Amino acid sequence: MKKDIHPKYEEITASCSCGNVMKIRSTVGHDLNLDVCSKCHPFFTGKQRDVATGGRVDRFNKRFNI
Amino acid sequence: DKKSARIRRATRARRKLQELGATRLVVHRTPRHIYAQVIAPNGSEVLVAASTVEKAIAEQLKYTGNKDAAAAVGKAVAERALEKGIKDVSFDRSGFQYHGRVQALADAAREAGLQF
Amino acid sequence: MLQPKRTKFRKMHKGRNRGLAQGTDVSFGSFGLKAVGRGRLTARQIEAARRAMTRAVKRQGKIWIRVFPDKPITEKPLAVRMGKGKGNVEYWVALIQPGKVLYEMDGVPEELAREAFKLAAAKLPIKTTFVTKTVM
Amino acid sequence: AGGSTRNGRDSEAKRLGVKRFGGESVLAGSIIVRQRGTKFHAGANVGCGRDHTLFAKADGKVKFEVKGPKNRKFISIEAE
Amino acid sequence: GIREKIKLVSSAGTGHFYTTTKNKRTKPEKLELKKFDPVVRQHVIYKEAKIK
Amino acid sequence: AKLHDYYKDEVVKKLMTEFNYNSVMQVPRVEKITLNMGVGEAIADKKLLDNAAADLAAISGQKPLITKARKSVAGFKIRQGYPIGCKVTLRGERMWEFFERLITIAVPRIRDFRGLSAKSFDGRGNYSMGVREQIIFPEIDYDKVDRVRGLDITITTTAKSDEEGRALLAAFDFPFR
RNA sequence: CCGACUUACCAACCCGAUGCAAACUGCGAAUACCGGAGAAUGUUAUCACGGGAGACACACGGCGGGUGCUAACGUCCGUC
RNA sequence: UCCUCCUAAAGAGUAACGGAGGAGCACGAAGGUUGGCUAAUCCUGGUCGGACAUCAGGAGGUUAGUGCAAUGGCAUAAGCCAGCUUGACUGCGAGCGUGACGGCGCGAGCAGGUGCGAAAGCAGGUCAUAGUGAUCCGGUGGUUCUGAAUGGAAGGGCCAUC
RNA sequence: UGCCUGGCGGCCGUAGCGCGGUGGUCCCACCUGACCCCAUGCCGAACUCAGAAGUGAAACGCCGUAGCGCCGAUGGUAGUGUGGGGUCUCCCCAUGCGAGAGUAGGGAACUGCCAGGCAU
RNA sequence: GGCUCU
RNA sequence: GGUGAGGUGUCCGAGUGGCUGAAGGAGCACGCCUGGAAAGUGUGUAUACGGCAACGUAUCGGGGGUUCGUAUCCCCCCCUCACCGCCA
Ligand SMILES: [Mg+2]
Ligand SMILES: [Mg+2]
Ligand SMILES: [Mg+2]
Ligand SMILES: [Mg+2]
Ligand SMILES: [Mg+2]
Ligand SMILES: [Mg+2]
Ligand SMILES: [Mg+2]
Ligand SMILES: [Mg+2]
Ligand SMILES: [Mg+2]
Ligand SMILES: [Mg+2]
Ligand SMILES: [Mg+2]
Ligand SMILES: [Mg+2]
Ligand SMILES: [Mg+2]
Ligand SMILES: [Mg+2]
Ligand SMILES: [Mg+2]
Ligand SMILES: [Mg+2]
Ligand SMILES: [Mg+2]
Ligand SMILES: [Mg+2]
Ligand SMILES: [Mg+2]
Ligand SMILES: [Mg+2]
Ligand SMILES: [Mg+2]
Ligand SMILES: [Mg+2]
Ligand SMILES: [Mg+2]
Ligand SMILES: [Mg+2]
Ligand SMILES: [Mg+2]
Ligand SMILES: [Mg+2]
Ligand SMILES: [Mg+2]
Ligand SMILES: [Zn+2]
């Protein structure tokens, strides 16, 4: 790499709400607090639940009984 | 690719010495070894040659592809050229940069007595 | 009327028309109308002989035209002296050597092709003949 | 009466070509070929000018020959 | 013919000069080149002057 | 180089198993990652370019190469030679460390993230994706920016086919779907 | 919106077949031209210098062509 | 007036109120050198981004490019980037080409001094061919060459130049 | 002397492509790392340096293969120099030269110098 | 100040 | 027959390579005043096609062509205007 032209790229710590402590090299300098990491992102549960089509016949039979 | 672009990078100065009628020193550089040979102006026969593939040079060395081996090669080929009476040559870098092992070789041949 | 859509140049030398032809054998169809004489045809002579054989076959079968008029022919106007530039392009011709197959035809019987090509050759200035396909 | 033209022009003939042919003894400096490009190429003892003119650097006979992978035409001076 | 003509005066005190052209619109800064002066037989800085 | 170590220990064993390669050199590997920001509106002013290179220089700690127009087109009112974009090539450890921060931090920070596409491998293993907004990286401060940019990521790998790259990124748990 | 299909309307590229070109050429003559060697022949027929000119309105015929209508005892070039 | 192609008949040359196109400049880098690089177009994928910017891969292999017309050239690139620079040097020039001539052109090498390069080497403007105007007269700088009794000077000469 | 490899040539497609196979002791290649020599109009990608853990995957080399590319007769044809002739916009005769395209067929190069490795 | 037709 | 110039949205009218898919104005449309019309006054304002209008493309007589790009530049076909088409 060249000497002077590049920004400072320093290893810092980024911790998350799921407690995922992760040390990365970054240009931030200070420590980082996250919200979701790849461990705690609802890609493996939430996107599966979040379709939620529901049935029209089951709503109909649900609203009463004959 | 890299071999071909090195040849394209070398084939101008080779044809220039071809029309100059110059007895020419040919350097060839690998990551492990470095080669040298003095070629007649007809381009079809050699006069002297040295390498880090030779036992008499490689056995005195640590690694065949560093600058100290390249200087030992350029010294040996210069001492063989002056033994055979070849004094004035022209250095063909063969598409490499005049830098590092190539420069240390040519500086060794200049120091040992060749004139180029 | 056949005519090139584009040309690299607008005018052309008069040239000559010597030599034998190349399109000699009946390539595509079964029957052919071969030129024996020498000369130049036009788009009018070509289209008139095409109409005469298309009508003589009652649009049955397929007709190829081997030639194409690509040579421009200039003329000077009336009451114009011989200098002052090359004349204006008036019409288009095709140079015809002996042996050139002019037309081809199939899907019809031989006698119908004879009488159709005869009606076409009656529209042409040059002397023609009737030919058939040949193996080799 | 009437007309005109736009096609009256042409330039002067530059007298290019091969001035000395093969097997033809020349003096040093003698022009062999005048040409626009390198339709021919300079071989042994033959220089190429500013306008791609091929001149003899020495004395001797002209040798035409075809060399190279591209089959380019080279002109050389044999010794004499 | 917007490209006017100038002269490159020797800075060796001699009145020797080379003559040349420049575009004074696009190159307002003065031209200075190191050229041979045949009187002194040295390479001397020449400077742009008016062709006069 | 955490993912480079994870490549060298578990991905190579996985792909050698799931492809039955004769040699270990026959395995795919990533080679470079290219980060383009096409800024076609910087012909109006350099400051949009000057700030886009500053943002992309903070993401990956390299000075970006300001790209220019290969030729001139009038539909976009540009001439051949105008700076029209910026790129960064990432190789080596900085490639791996950006690719870690990518798939661990920035991809979860996409608004309405629902997966990637497995239909973006350009027929020859090389994957290309495009992000709408640079704020998904935490390098960018949210108050400090003014313009929502977007960039595109191009992972150039040594996989010959398309599936060998799909399995390679899936070996890096790349969130396809 | 996604699209349905079929269809009596054409068609890029590519492939195969077939022609054309003064200002096309992946080929390429005969002649001509340049240079060298060698006989025989020819009243040096060759070149250089010097004295004196005349001439610079050509024609037709053959061949190769431009133009014109492959018109002209037409016109303009090359060659005999 | 000048340049390019055809006519032009395979050396040169070759006419017409024959067929087609351009020039009357530009560049202090668009020159020199060293080092390096190699296109057009199309296909796929990809944020804004769209037929068409930029990015990544593949086909292709110069169909591109050349400061401008056309032709001939161009990969050892003459095409494209960067570094250092001023050989866009002065005196000469063997030897040839081309013209009726005036003239025009090519040129290795020599002397001096210079630039790049480690060096061999290259460089006496630009890929080449258009980008131009005789003499007289007159102007400017330099030079004791001359200086109408003598010493100067005027004026003239020579060199550069308008 | 044989085999293999590297470098420099000769020659310039009968030498090039394609398809299939094969090679790792050496060589070569990829390959590991880079504070340094040096480098990136960003990037150790390239260039360069220090090396040698791995692999012949790619590349390269070798072998095979007629899908091409290429080469290519013989005969004939076209043209044409000279002389002559005709029905004279074009042809013919005597004689000399003689293509191109195409066909049969060939064809998966040949060779030199030096160095190294393994065999002999 | 002046400003048409029905 | 030739020479030169020109061809601009509804009309006139500017517009000699880069915010010209067009000035400005009139006119057309809509609104207000008016008992109703005008005249005023205010506001707008081309035809097509792709999706859906996200904007895009075309259109300076017609048709080609170049330059990254033409309403402006070159060609043809045309139309019109001016001049000449003479000596015998
Ligand atoms: Mg021809
Ligand atoms: Mg006269
Ligand atoms: Mg006369
Ligand atoms: Mg005459
Ligand atoms: Mg005649
Ligand atoms: Mg005639
Ligand atoms: Mg006559
Ligand atoms: Mg006459
Ligand atoms: Mg005459
Ligand atoms: Mg005659
Ligand atoms: Mg000639
Ligand atoms: Mg001739
Ligand atoms: Mg170079
Ligand atoms: Mg695209
Ligand atoms: Mg140049
Ligand atoms: Mg040039
Ligand atoms: Mg006078
Ligand atoms: Mg006196
Ligand atoms: Mg005196
Ligand atoms: Mg193979
Ligand atoms: Mg490496
Ligand atoms: Mg392999
Ligand atoms: Mg034969
Ligand atoms: Mg043959
Ligand atoms: Mg072969
Ligand atoms: Mg093979
Ligand atoms: Mg427009
Ligand atoms: Zn988390």
mmCIF file with all atom_site columns, all heavy atoms in Angstrom, chain A residues 55-65:
data_model
loop_
_atom_site.group_PDB
_atom_site.id
_atom_site.type_symbol
_atom_site.label_atom_id
_atom_site.label_alt_id
_atom_site.label_comp_id
_atom_site.label_asym_id
_atom_site.label_entity_id
_atom_site.label_seq_id
_atom_site.pdbx_PDB_ins_code
_atom_site.Cartn_x
_atom_site.Cartn_y
_atom_site.Cartn_z
_atom_site.occupancy
_atom_site.B_iso_or_equiv
_atom_site.pdbx_formal_charge
_atom_site.auth_seq_id
_atom_site.auth_comp_id
_atom_site.auth_asym_id
_atom_site.auth_atom_id
_atom_site.pdbx_PDB_model_num
ATOM 1  N N   . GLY A 1 55 ? -55.886 -17.913 5.887  1.00 0.00 ? 55 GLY A N   1
ATOM 2  C CA  . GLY A 1 55 ? -56.904 -18.487 5.030  1.00 0.00 ? 55 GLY A CA  1
ATOM 3  C C   . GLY A 1 55 ? -58.194 -17.690 5.096  1.00 0.00 ? 55 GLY A C   1
ATOM 4  O O   . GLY A 1 55 ? -58.639 -17.281 6.176  1.00 0.00 ? 55 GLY A O   1
ATOM 5  N N   . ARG A 1 56 ? -58.872 -17.644 3.961  1.00 0.00 ? 56 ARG A N   1
ATOM 6  C CA  . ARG A 1 56 ? -60.123 -16.925 3.854  1.00 0.00 ? 56 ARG A CA  1
ATOM 7  C C   . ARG A 1 56 ? -61.250 -17.816 4.334  1.00 0.00 ? 56 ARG A C   1
ATOM 8  O O   . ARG A 1 56 ? -62.160 -17.364 5.044  1.00 0.00 ? 56 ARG A O   1
ATOM 9  C CB  . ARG A 1 56 ? -60.322 -16.518 2.393  1.00 0.00 ? 56 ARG A CB  1
ATOM 10 C CG  . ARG A 1 56 ? -61.428 -15.554 2.113  1.00 0.00 ? 56 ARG A CG  1
ATOM 11 C CD  . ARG A 1 56 ? -61.115 -14.193 2.668  1.00 0.00 ? 56 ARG A CD  1
ATOM 12 N NE  . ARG A 1 56 ? -62.191 -13.248 2.408  1.00 0.00 ? 56 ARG A NE  1
ATOM 13 C CZ  . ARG A 1 56 ? -62.219 -12.008 2.879  1.00 0.00 ? 56 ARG A CZ  1
ATOM 14 N NH1 . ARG A 1 56 ? -61.243 -11.567 3.658  1.00 0.00 ? 56 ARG A NH1 1
ATOM 15 N NH2 . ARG A 1 56 ? -63.240 -11.217 2.591  1.00 0.00 ? 56 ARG A NH2 1
ATOM 16 N N   . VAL A 1 57 ? -61.155 -19.106 4.038  1.00 0.00 ? 57 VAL A N   1
ATOM 17 C CA  . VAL A 1 57 ? -62.153 -20.018 4.554  1.00 0.00 ? 57 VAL A CA  1
ATOM 18 C C   . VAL A 1 57 ? -62.015 -20.152 6.063  1.00 0.00 ? 57 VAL A C   1
ATOM 19 O O   . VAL A 1 57 ? -63.015 -20.261 6.776  1.00 0.00 ? 57 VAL A O   1
ATOM 20 C CB  . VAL A 1 57 ? -62.048 -21.376 3.856  1.00 0.00 ? 57 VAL A CB  1
ATOM 21 C CG1 . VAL A 1 57 ? -63.017 -22.357 4.492  1.00 0.00 ? 57 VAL A CG1 1
ATOM 22 C CG2 . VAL A 1 57 ? -62.299 -21.233 2.379  1.00 0.00 ? 57 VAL A CG2 1
ATOM 23 N N   . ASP A 1 58 ? -60.785 -20.192 6.583  1.00 0.00 ? 58 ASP A N   1
ATOM 24 C CA  . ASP A 1 58 ? -60.662 -20.308 8.034  1.00 0.00 ? 58 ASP A CA  1
ATOM 25 C C   . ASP A 1 58 ? -61.115 -19.033 8.727  1.00 0.00 ? 58 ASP A C   1
ATOM 26 O O   . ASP A 1 58 ? -61.706 -19.114 9.800  1.00 0.00 ? 58 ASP A O   1
ATOM 27 C CB  . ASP A 1 58 ? -59.241 -20.690 8.444  1.00 0.00 ? 58 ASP A CB  1
ATOM 28 C CG  . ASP A 1 58 ? -58.274 -19.526 8.304  1.00 0.00 ? 58 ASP A CG  1
ATOM 29 O OD1 . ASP A 1 58 ? -58.359 -18.626 9.170  1.00 0.00 ? 58 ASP A OD1 1
ATOM 30 O OD2 . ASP A 1 58 ? -57.470 -19.519 7.348  1.00 0.00 ? 58 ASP A OD2 1
ATOM 31 N N   . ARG A 1 59 ? -60.906 -17.846 8.126  1.00 0.00 ? 59 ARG A N   1
ATOM 32 C CA  . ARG A 1 59 ? -61.495 -16.658 8.754  1.00 0.00 ? 59 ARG A CA  1
ATOM 33 C C   . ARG A 1 59 ? -63.018 -16.743 8.728  1.00 0.00 ? 59 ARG A C   1
ATOM 34 O O   . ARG A 1 59 ? -63.692 -16.403 9.715  1.00 0.00 ? 59 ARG A O   1
ATOM 35 C CB  . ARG A 1 59 ? -60.993 -15.376 8.092  1.00 0.00 ? 59 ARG A CB  1
ATOM 36 C CG  . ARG A 1 59 ? -61.643 -14.987 6.801  1.00 0.00 ? 59 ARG A CG  1
ATOM 37 C CD  . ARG A 1 59 ? -61.266 -13.570 6.465  1.00 0.00 ? 59 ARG A CD  1
ATOM 38 N NE  . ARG A 1 59 ? -62.303 -12.624 6.846  1.00 0.00 ? 59 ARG A NE  1
ATOM 39 C CZ  . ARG A 1 59 ? -62.164 -11.305 6.776  1.00 0.00 ? 59 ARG A CZ  1
ATOM 40 N NH1 . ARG A 1 59 ? -61.025 -10.776 6.350  1.00 0.00 ? 59 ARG A NH1 1
ATOM 41 N NH2 . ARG A 1 59 ? -63.161 -10.513 7.140  1.00 0.00 ? 59 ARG A NH2 1
ATOM 42 N N   . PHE A 1 60 ? -63.572 -17.316 7.659  1.00 0.00 ? 60 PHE A N   1
ATOM 43 C CA  . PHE A 1 60 ? -65.020 -17.370 7.546  1.00 0.00 ? 60 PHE A CA  1
ATOM 44 C C   . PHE A 1 60 ? -65.563 -18.325 8.590  1.00 0.00 ? 60 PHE A C   1
ATOM 45 O O   . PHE A 1 60 ? -66.526 -18.009 9.296  1.00 0.00 ? 60 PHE A O   1
ATOM 46 C CB  . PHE A 1 60 ? -65.402 -17.816 6.138  1.00 0.00 ? 60 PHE A CB  1
ATOM 47 C CG  . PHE A 1 60 ? -66.871 -17.863 5.885  1.00 0.00 ? 60 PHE A CG  1
ATOM 48 C CD1 . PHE A 1 60 ? -67.501 -16.853 5.194  1.00 0.00 ? 60 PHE A CD1 1
ATOM 49 C CD2 . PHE A 1 60 ? -67.618 -18.939 6.306  1.00 0.00 ? 60 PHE A CD2 1
ATOM 50 C CE1 . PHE A 1 60 ? -68.848 -16.906 4.949  1.00 0.00 ? 60 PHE A CE1 1
ATOM 51 C CE2 . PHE A 1 60 ? -68.965 -18.997 6.059  1.00 0.00 ? 60 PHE A CE2 1
ATOM 52 C CZ  . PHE A 1 60 ? -69.580 -17.980 5.383  1.00 0.00 ? 60 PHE A CZ  1
ATOM 53 N N   . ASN A 1 61 ? -64.950 -19.498 8.715  1.00 0.00 ? 61 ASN A N   1
ATOM 54 C CA  . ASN A 1 61 ? -65.481 -20.476 9.641  1.00 0.00 ? 61 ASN A CA  1
ATOM 55 C C   . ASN A 1 61 ? -65.176 -20.038 11.060 1.00 0.00 ? 61 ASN A C   1
ATOM 56 O O   . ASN A 1 61 ? -65.819 -20.505 12.006 1.00 0.00 ? 61 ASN A O   1
ATOM 57 C CB  . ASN A 1 61 ? -64.876 -21.843 9.353  1.00 0.00 ? 61 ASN A CB  1
ATOM 58 C CG  . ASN A 1 61 ? -65.269 -22.374 7.993  1.00 0.00 ? 61 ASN A CG  1
ATOM 59 O OD1 . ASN A 1 61 ? -64.416 -22.651 7.150  1.00 0.00 ? 61 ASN A OD1 1
ATOM 60 N ND2 . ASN A 1 61 ? -66.568 -22.512 7.767  1.00 0.00 ? 61 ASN A ND2 1
ATOM 61 N N   . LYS A 1 62 ? -64.194 -19.146 11.212 1.00 0.00 ? 62 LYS A N   1
ATOM 62 C CA  . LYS A 1 62 ? -63.797 -18.637 12.509 1.00 0.00 ? 62 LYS A CA  1
ATOM 63 C C   . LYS A 1 62 ? -64.794 -17.631 13.042 1.00 0.00 ? 62 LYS A C   1
ATOM 64 O O   . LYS A 1 62 ? -64.962 -17.516 14.260 1.00 0.00 ? 62 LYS A O   1
ATOM 65 C CB  . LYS A 1 62 ? -62.419 -17.996 12.390 1.00 0.00 ? 62 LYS A CB  1
ATOM 66 C CG  . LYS A 1 62 ? -61.815 -17.529 13.680 1.00 0.00 ? 62 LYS A CG  1
ATOM 67 C CD  . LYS A 1 62 ? -60.457 -16.922 13.396 1.00 0.00 ? 62 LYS A CD  1
ATOM 68 C CE  . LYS A 1 62 ? -59.742 -16.477 14.657 1.00 0.00 ? 62 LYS A CE  1
ATOM 69 N NZ  . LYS A 1 62 ? -60.463 -15.333 15.283 1.00 0.00 ? 62 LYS A NZ  1
ATOM 70 N N   . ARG A 1 63 ? -65.465 -16.895 12.156 1.00 0.00 ? 63 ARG A N   1
ATOM 71 C CA  . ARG A 1 63 ? -66.209 -15.750 12.660 1.00 0.00 ? 63 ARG A CA  1
ATOM 72 C C   . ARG A 1 63 ? -67.490 -16.176 13.354 1.00 0.00 ? 63 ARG A C   1
ATOM 73 O O   . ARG A 1 63 ? -68.088 -15.369 14.073 1.00 0.00 ? 63 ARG A O   1
ATOM 74 C CB  . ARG A 1 63 ? -66.552 -14.776 11.536 1.00 0.00 ? 63 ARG A CB  1
ATOM 75 C CG  . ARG A 1 63 ? -65.352 -14.143 10.885 1.00 0.00 ? 63 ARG A CG  1
ATOM 76 C CD  . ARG A 1 63 ? -65.707 -13.444 9.596  1.00 0.00 ? 63 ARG A CD  1
ATOM 77 N NE  . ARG A 1 63 ? -66.398 -12.179 9.815  1.00 0.00 ? 63 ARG A NE  1
ATOM 78 C CZ  . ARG A 1 63 ? -65.789 -11.007 9.953  1.00 0.00 ? 63 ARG A CZ  1
ATOM 79 N NH1 . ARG A 1 63 ? -64.467 -10.926 9.914  1.00 0.00 ? 63 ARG A NH1 1
ATOM 80 N NH2 . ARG A 1 63 ? -66.505 -9.912  10.145 1.00 0.00 ? 63 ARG A NH2 1
ATOM 81 N N   . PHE A 1 64 ? -67.918 -17.416 13.155 1.00 0.00 ? 64 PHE A N   1
ATOM 82 C CA  . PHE A 1 64 ? -69.155 -17.908 13.740 1.00 0.00 ? 64 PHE A CA  1
ATOM 83 C C   . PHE A 1 64 ? -69.173 -19.428 13.648 1.00 0.00 ? 64 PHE A C   1
ATOM 84 O O   . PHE A 1 64 ? -68.166 -20.064 13.320 1.00 0.00 ? 64 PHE A O   1
ATOM 85 C CB  . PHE A 1 64 ? -70.353 -17.296 13.020 1.00 0.00 ? 64 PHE A CB  1
ATOM 86 C CG  . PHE A 1 64 ? -70.383 -17.608 11.566 1.00 0.00 ? 64 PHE A CG  1
ATOM 87 C CD1 . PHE A 1 64 ? -70.962 -18.777 11.107 1.00 0.00 ? 64 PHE A CD1 1
ATOM 88 C CD2 . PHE A 1 64 ? -69.813 -16.740 10.655 1.00 0.00 ? 64 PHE A CD2 1
ATOM 89 C CE1 . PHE A 1 64 ? -70.983 -19.069 9.765  1.00 0.00 ? 64 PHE A CE1 1
ATOM 90 C CE2 . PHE A 1 64 ? -69.831 -17.020 9.313  1.00 0.00 ? 64 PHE A CE2 1
ATOM 91 C CZ  . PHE A 1 64 ? -70.415 -18.189 8.863  1.00 0.00 ? 64 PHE A CZ  1
ATOM 92 N N   . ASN A 1 65 ? -70.336 -20.007 13.940 1.00 0.00 ? 65 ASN A N   1
ATOM 93 C CA  . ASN A 1 65 ? -70.639 -21.394 13.625 1.00 0.00 ? 65 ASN A CA  1
ATOM 94 C C   . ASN A 1 65 ? -72.066 -21.462 13.103 1.00 0.00 ? 65 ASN A C   1
ATOM 95 O O   . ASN A 1 65 ? -72.914 -20.649 13.477 1.00 0.00 ? 65 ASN A O   1
ATOM 96 C CB  . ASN A 1 65 ? -70.461 -22.305 14.843 1.00 0.00 ? 65 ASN A CB  1
ATOM 97 C CG  . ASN A 1 65 ? -69.009 -22.497 15.213 1.00 0.00 ? 65 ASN A CG  1
ATOM 98 O OD1 . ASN A 1 65 ? -68.370 -23.459 14.789 1.00 0.00 ? 65 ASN A OD1 1
ATOM 99 N ND2 . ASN A 1 65 ? -68.475 -21.575 16.000 1.00 0.00 ? 65 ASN A ND2 1
#
